Amino acid sequence: MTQTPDREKALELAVAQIEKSYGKGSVMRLGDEARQPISVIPTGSIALDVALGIGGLPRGRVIEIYGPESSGKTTVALHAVANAQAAGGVAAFIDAEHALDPDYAKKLGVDTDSLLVSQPDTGEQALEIADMLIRSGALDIVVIDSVAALVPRAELEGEMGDSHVGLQARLMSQALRKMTGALNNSGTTAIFINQLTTTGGKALKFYASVRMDVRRVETLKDGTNAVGNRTRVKVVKNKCLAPFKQAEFDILYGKGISREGSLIDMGVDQGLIRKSGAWFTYEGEQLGQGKENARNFLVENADVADEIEKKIKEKLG
Numbered sequence: 001m002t003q004t005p006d007r008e009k010a011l012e013l014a015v016a017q018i019e020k021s022y023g024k025g026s027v028m029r030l031g032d033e034a035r036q037p038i039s040v041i042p043t044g045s046i047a048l049d050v051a052l053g054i055g056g057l058p059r060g061r062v063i064e065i066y067g068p069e070s071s072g073k074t075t076v077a078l079h080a081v082a083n084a085q086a087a088g089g090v091a092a093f094i095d096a097e098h099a100l101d102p103d104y105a106k107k108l109g110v111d112t113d114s115l116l117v118s119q120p121d122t123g124e125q126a127l128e129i130a131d132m133l134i135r136s137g138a139l140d141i142v143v144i145d146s147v148a149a150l151v152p153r154a155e156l157e158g159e160m161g162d163s164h165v166g167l168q169a170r171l172m173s174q175a176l177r178k179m180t181g182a183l184n185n186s187g188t189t190a191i192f193i194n195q196l197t198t199t200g201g202k203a204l205k206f207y208a209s210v211r212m213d214v215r216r217v218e219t220l221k222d223g224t225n226a227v228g229n230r231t232r233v234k235v236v237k238n239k240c241l242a243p244f245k246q247a248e249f250d251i252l253y254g255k256g257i258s259r260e261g262s263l264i265d266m267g268v269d270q271g272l273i274r275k276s277g278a279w280f281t282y283e284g285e286q287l288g289q290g291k292e293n294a295r296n297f298l299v300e301n302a303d304v305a306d307e308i309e310k311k312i313k314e315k316l317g
């Protein structure tokens with residue numbers, strides 16, 4: 001085929017016709033600029049926000065965060081909550097692990113007091129409770145802790161002959177379908193924490209519109225012991241912007257995600273902040289000597305912090 005121009009035009013209608021029936025994120029080029037909506041739940045880390053493309057989590061979708069135990073998910077999730085919350089939004093927390101610490105959550109910015117919590121007996125109850133709580137069209141964000149802890153009724157009792165094995169993947173399958181509808185039809189985004197899959201996974205893997213692979217990189221040293229960690233997240237799936245994009249941020253013990261720290265790391269890799277060796281400078285005057293001093297600077301001089309964060313959004317968005 002001695003073609004050339006008439007190709008790019010035909011390929012247009014291809015994609016064009018693909019999206020028209022399968023959705024707008026069905027086909028993409030890893031290079032495509034990202035589409036951008038009105039609502040988006042900031043994750044609390046400008047780095048990851050600019051790796052999700054839309055600058056934060058997508059409403060009306062189902063998000064999946066998975067990875068080793070003690071990676072960062074619940075933090076990354078609780079943050080999403082604090083944001084959705086600080087915008088006058090209401091959130092619920094479906095607990096199947098019984099491992100939430102409000103003091104921490106509160107430090108991150110969660111308004112625990114008005115944080116709706118639920119602790120289901122069986123897995124179905126947990127998902128059925130999340131359903132209506134979703135159909136009310138009142139919740140902004142809902143997070144189910146552990147897709148691996150939602151044991152079906154059967155297993156929880158004595159089981160049945162009929163045909164068992166793989167009761168979750170079904171409990172999930174069924175659930176996910178009935179739910180997907182109410183989600184992308186109410187504007188409530190739902191987060192599913194997965195503990196490192198094949199569990200109830202499969203189902204979710206596909207329904208999920210954004211899949212996050214969270215993992216700890218190093219144990220952030222601090223001259224002393226260990227303030228926080230160096231988490232690395234990678235959107236393995238993302239129907240809202242080109243996927244396979246990754247980000248890294250710090251999680252200070254008891255402090256949570258270091259917004260400021262991200263402000264700096266993104267700052268330098270965007271030319272807005274300079275590095276005169278150990279020295280962190282920003283458009284003239286100095287920020288400090290060493291990322292921590294820098295961070296410690298931004299944390300209090302919160303007035304400038306916002307300036308920098310503001311500009312990075314005018315630079316990429």
Ligand SMILES: Nc1ncnc2c1ncn2[C@@H]1O[C@H](COP(=O)(O)OP(=O)(O)OP(O)(O)=S)[C@@H](O)[C@H]1O
Binds near residue numbers: 071075195
């Ligand atoms: N209650 C807490 N108090 C102090 N630090 C915490 C607390 N919960 C989490 N962290 C820190 O945050 C990081 C892990 O976030 P987690 O909430 O454990 O998320 P995961 O998403 O890692 O969670 P499991 O799956 O580990 S709860 C680590 O660096 C922890 O030290």
